[PDB]
Copies of this chain bind each other. A is one copy, B any other.
Amino acid sequence: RRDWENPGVTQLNRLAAHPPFASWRNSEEARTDRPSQQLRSLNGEWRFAWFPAPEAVPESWLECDLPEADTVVVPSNWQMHGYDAPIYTNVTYPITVNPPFVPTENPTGCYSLTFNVDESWLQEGQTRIIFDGVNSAFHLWCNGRWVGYGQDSRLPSEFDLSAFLRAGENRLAVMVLRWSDGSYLEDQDMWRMSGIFRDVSLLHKPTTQISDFHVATRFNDDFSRAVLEAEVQMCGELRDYLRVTVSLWQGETQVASGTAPFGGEIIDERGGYADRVTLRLNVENPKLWSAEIPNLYRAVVELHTADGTLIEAEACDVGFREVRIENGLLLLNGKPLLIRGVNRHEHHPLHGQVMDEQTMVQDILLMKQNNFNAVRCSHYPNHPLWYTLCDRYGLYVVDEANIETHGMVPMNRLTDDPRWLPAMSERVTRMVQRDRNHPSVIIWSLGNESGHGANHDALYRWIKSVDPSRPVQYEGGGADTTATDIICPMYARVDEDQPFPAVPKWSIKKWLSLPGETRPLILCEYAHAMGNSLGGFAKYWQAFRQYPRLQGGFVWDWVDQSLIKYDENGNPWSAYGGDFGDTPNDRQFCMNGLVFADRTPHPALTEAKHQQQFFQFRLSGQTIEVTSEYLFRHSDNELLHWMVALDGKPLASGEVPLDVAPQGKQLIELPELPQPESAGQLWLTVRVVQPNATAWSEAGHISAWQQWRLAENLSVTLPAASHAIPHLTTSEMDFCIELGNKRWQFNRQSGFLSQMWIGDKKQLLTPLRDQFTRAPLDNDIAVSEDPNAWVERWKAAGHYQAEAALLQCTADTLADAVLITTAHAWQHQGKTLFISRKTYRIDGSGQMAITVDVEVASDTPHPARIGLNCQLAQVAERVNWLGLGPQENYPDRLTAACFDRWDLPLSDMYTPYVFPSENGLRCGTRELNYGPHQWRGDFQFNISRYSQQQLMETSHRHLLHAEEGTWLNIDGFHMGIGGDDSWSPSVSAEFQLSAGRYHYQLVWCQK
């Protein structure tokens, strides 16, 4: 039958989809969500054998264990066990495009398990098997008899095994196909793996049973009263003595309860549903659910007889909340949301696509701790537990159908094709039937990157019809089609339009007001966090806050999809596309997250946390104005800490309790700030601290911060002039300067300071020279699978090959110092790119002041940076500076950083991006200390054991090796990093170094 090559066959003998069941036979257990003896897990050790095609599978396997098989854990992705390679492809399908056919060589995973079933389960009732996730299609046999077939790798497939089992031992055999026609709908940008990768379980239900239940909550105008409506359906024999009781609890208190016999209201000329009933419960002053306060009730659904015998119980967590779009705004409990979201794929560096509770909880806590309030299930229904954690911890969720046909040409080839309507329809309907009772799901999504086809319109209407409680969104076909209630573009810019034909990406501000447009706009993906990125994040936040209808978005994306591999010596390392022999592949494009695969944060995570803060602040005089962005809670676990410092020197500080109602304001008046002991800039830093632990944070957590400059007292006092004067020695080869124990040597042919000595010690490994390039970032490279790419432009202009030419090198003696003047030109193929003019003035105090004036040809691409570099001979333990920090920060990604005195071990000054590049910069620095050296001015810098050259020649962080010494890059100016997208120029004009002429000054001295 080749069911795996026919989109008209998506399953055989599969049971209806429905919300999570456990068939409790004790109501109390159901109330508290205790494990159910009737829901058994079949997870653990299974037998597995790999074959190259289904035709290669021996018939014997059906009845008996293959002695060649291995014992492996389930759930798992077979790739993770080494059976075949995982493939990383972004857009292009991993198999030839020839729907609905798949390759003849099709990796087949043959799983089996010998397990016990007690007579008790078979004497009465129904025993079904549930496979929560099988990638991509499979056939199932039990005790050698075929049972059924299934597709859609991201929803549960259930089969009735009642007629196939026997008491005692039984054997299941599952043949899993890697590719199937379902793969045409699973083209998400992620590793392509396969196997039985979600839980497998057995569930016993009685013959007369609860087969479905839907829960709804409706409110009066001010949410002071609600009606919970529970529709219950049964299967099995209708009898008048049957009853359904629905009880609602808030903690240990029962709020309401109602009971009724089956038999629904009249529906049409033929009557009503005699196998259903709707119970309605009034609830006064319900505690409402939100991501701010995830108040939950428990609904327990009992199927029982009138005499009072329980047949079975089902249940769920209920969050009383209304989601509606009104007047152009998305409202939650009548208030307009501000989505601080992130896209999150199911990825584990060791386990592949298998999810576990610990990782899920770790992700949600880091999300919450970083001011995220929402998550998009990019791009398929998640493991069931995700929803329960979101309901209980409090996150808004976008639940998305497992439909992505990005590699088709044009993109909607399948989605506009009625023959694909059935297959797509099951992806949407079964998701809704499974997840509709979760309060955390606030919006349904039709899938991702599958163009816009009629199938979409049909399905959009189906959902609107069956579940009016949530908006439906879909971005394909231009982000604003008839299949979406929300304008939900991906990578639309704040101010700049990207007018692509047919599917333009307008500036978000402009998009809201195009003629006739009235919907809210929430980006389904924005701020592509690949590598050293998130430049311009603040620009989005400023617009979201200014424009009512700009309600936020979902950053792309949470975690890097890197996988662990082992080197020849068994050490682990982070791998990406192509590292498994996979080809074609999309290399590093699989790593776009705010956190590394092990959950360590990248530096961008702090920028996101700060911009996503829930408290806004303004300063006037001595008055700090705090405004709350919360919609529902008061600041009942928050205090404000304030600190004032003079050039990093702590002056004073205080604490004030915060008592701000949602959307309210609080005025706090700072105490008299009595004169600073010396000159400099006073800085005010405020931090919102949570004194009490919560379910998602520890006592002391800081949730928000802000700084301002206060009074500045410029230094007008002079320097107690030199006890001495430096001496200059001139030679054809060099200009040497000596002062006490110091010596500086300027090479006359090169025109650079080539060596420095303190005592007998040489301070330099490589001379101090101008630098106008950087080890390109992922965004500079711009590839997702462009000669407009910054890297391309730079290379083409000769920026990385340019050679300095000496125009002038002279020495002069002043009354108290020695002054060296140089001028160099950087040229390429006759073209003068840059001209650097400098003066170095060494004085009686031993300080070397360097003044640099650079000219940039207006017609060369603006340079990545304008500074100097050198390789210091020494390797020191700490890096101390007065500037922004403590983490890495760049011009267009420095808002989260704070101006203060920071001191870190050298290593923290390096950000180990998997794909190495320029990294570790710190901006707005006025003082930098390392070893015996001190540099002063107003610059940006990075310091590490890796040169820019090495970083640009290395593909993987594990292959980096520390060089002799310490490479110092000190810049007067540095270009922003961009990141609106990672596959086109994305650095805003204001962060490009296009001024033509640049000036900067550094003071280098000892410590």
Within 8 Å CB of A503, what residues of B? Answer: 268-269
Partner of A459, one of B271, B274, B409, B458: B458
Structural contact, A410 and B273, CB atoms closer than 8 A = yes
Within 8 Å CB of A411, what residues of B? Answer: 267-270
Within 8 Å CB of A465, what residues of B? Answer: 454, 457-458, 482
Shortest A974–chain B CB gap in Å is: 33
Q: Which residues of chain A from 239 to 290 have a CB within 8 Å of any chain B CB?
A: 265-274
Shortest A404–chain B CB gap in Å is: 12
Q: Which residues of chain A from 4 to 21 have a CB within 8 Å of any chain B CB?
A: 6, 8-12, 16
Structural contact, A409 and B462, CB atoms closer than 8 A = no
Within 8 Å CB of A457, what residues of B? Answer: 461-462, 464-465
A412, A419, A426, A478 pick with most chain B CB within 10 angstroms: A419
Within 8 Å CB of A1001, what residues of B? Answer: none
Structural contact, B462 and A267, CB atoms closer than 8 A = no
Structural contact, A270 and B410, CB atoms closer than 8 A = yes
Partner of A266, one of B419, B430, B454, B502: B502
Within 8 Å CB of A460, what residues of B? Answer: 461
Cα separation A426 to B480 with both chains bound (whole Å) = 28
Q: State the interface size on chain A (CB cutoff 8 A).
A: 57
Within 8 Å CB of A476, what residues of B? Answer: 268
Partner of A422, one of B274, B425, B477, B478: B425
Structural contact, B418 and A429, CB atoms closer than 8 A = yes
Within 8 Å CB of A429, what residues of B? Answer: 418, 421
Partner of A268, one of B269, B452, B461, B464: B452
Within 8 Å CB of A16, what residues of B? Answer: 419
- How does the 8 Å CB contact mask read for A446-474 relative to B, with 1 for contact and 0 for none? 00010110110111111011100000000
Q: Is A315 an interface residue (CB 8 A)?
A: no
Cα separation A454 to B419 with both chains bound (whole Å) = 19
* Known contacts A422-B421, A425-B421, A272 near B410 by CB under 8 Å: yes
Q: Which residues of chain A from 685 to 733 have a CB within 8 Å of any chain B CB?
A: none
Within 8 Å CB of A452, what residues of B? Answer: 268
Structural contact, B502 and A410, CB atoms closer than 8 A = no
Cα separation A274 to B410 with both chains bound (whole Å) = 9
Structural contact, A502 and B458, CB atoms closer than 8 A = no
Shortest A272–chain B CB gap in Å is: 5
Shortest A13–chain B CB gap in Å is: 9
Cα separation A422 to B426 with both chains bound (whole Å) = 9
Q: Is A501 an interface residue (CB 8 A)?
A: yes
Q: Quick one: closest B residue to A428, CB to CB?
A: B418
Q: Is A408 an interface residue (CB 8 A)?
A: yes
Q: Is A747 an interface residue (CB 8 A)?
A: no
Within 8 Å CB of A406, what residues of B? Answer: 270
Within 8 Å CB of A566, what residues of B? Answer: none
Structural contact, A412 and B461, CB atoms closer than 8 A = no
Structural contact, A267 and B11, CB atoms closer than 8 A = no
- How does the 8 Å CB contact mask read for A398-440 relative to B, with 1 for contact and 0 for none? 0000000011111111000011011001100110010000000
Q: Quick one: closest B residue to A433, CB to CB?
A: B418
Within 8 Å CB of A410, what residues of B? Answer: 266-268, 270-273
Structural contact, A269 and B419, CB atoms closer than 8 A = no
Structural contact, B271 and A409, CB atoms closer than 8 A = yes
Cα separation A419 to B12 with both chains bound (whole Å) = 12
Cα separation A269 to B451 with both chains bound (whole Å) = 8
- How does the 8 Å CB contact mask read for A1-44 relative to B, with 1 for contact and 0 for none? 10000101111100010000000000000000000000000000
Cα separation A1 to B409 with both chains bound (whole Å) = 35
A449, A457, A458, A503 pick with most chain B CB within 10 angstroms: A458
Cα separation A435 to B503 with both chains bound (whole Å) = 31
Cα separation A422 to B412 with both chains bound (whole Å) = 19
Q: Quick one: closest B residue to A456, CB to CB?
A: B465
Shortest A257–chain B CB gap in Å is: 28
- How does the 8 Å CB contact mask read for A106-142 relative to B, with 1 for contact and 0 for none? 0000000000000000000000000000000000000
Partner of A270, one of B11, B272, B409, B433: B409
Seen from chain A, the residues whose Cβ lies within 8 Å of a Cβ on chain B are: 1, 6, 8-12, 16, 265-274, 406-413, 418-419, 421-422, 425-426, 429-430, 433, 449, 451-452, 454-455, 457-462, 464-466, 476-478, 482, 500-503
23 A/B residue pairs, CB under 8 Å, sorted by A: A8-B8, A8-B422, A265-B502, A266-B410, A266-B501, A267-B451, A268-B451, A268-B478, A269-B411, A269-B451, A269-B503, A270-B407, A270-B408, A271-B409, A271-B410, A273-B410, A274-B409, A418-B429, A418-B430, A454-B462, A457-B462, A458-B459, A461-B461
Please give me the 6 A-B residue pairs with the lowest Cβ-Cβ distance, nearest first.
Answer: A422-B422, A461-B461, A418-B429, A458-B462, A267-B410, A457-B465
Other than the known A269-B503, A454-B466, what 7 A-B pairs have Cβ atoms closer than 8 Å?
A: A267-B411, A268-B411, A269-B411, A270-B408, A272-B410, A418-B462, A457-B465
